[PDB]
Amino acid sequence: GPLGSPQCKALYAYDAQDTDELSFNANDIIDIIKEDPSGWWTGRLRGKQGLFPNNYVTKI
Ligand SMILES: NCCCCCCCCN
Structure with missing residues (x-):
């Protein structure tokens, strides 16, 4: 593609609340894997994959 994935x-920092969730720090760059319509997106960061609330992030 002409752009990256x-x-x-x-x-804001998010602390996972379940085993299927992803934790991250404010300003972390997360790779988006899936964008569920609920806003629980699937991301990868530093060797972790998990669900996270999209209201904590901004697409770049
Ligand atoms: N712990 C996260 C639960 C929220 C539900 C995520 C939706 C996943 C749908 N495959």
């Missing part, structure tokens, strides 16, 4: 930048 989709990413977003965390606006």
Whole structure:
């Protein structure tokens, strides 16, 4: 593609609340794998994959 694969930048830190969730720090860059319509997106960051709330991030 002309652009990289989709990413977003965390606006706020998120601490996973379940085993299927992803934790990250504010300003972390997350690779987006899936964008569920609920806003629970699937991301990868530093050797972790998991669900995270999209209201904590901004697409870049
Ligand atoms: N712990 C996250 C639960 C929220 C539900 C995520 C939706 C996944 C749908 N495959």
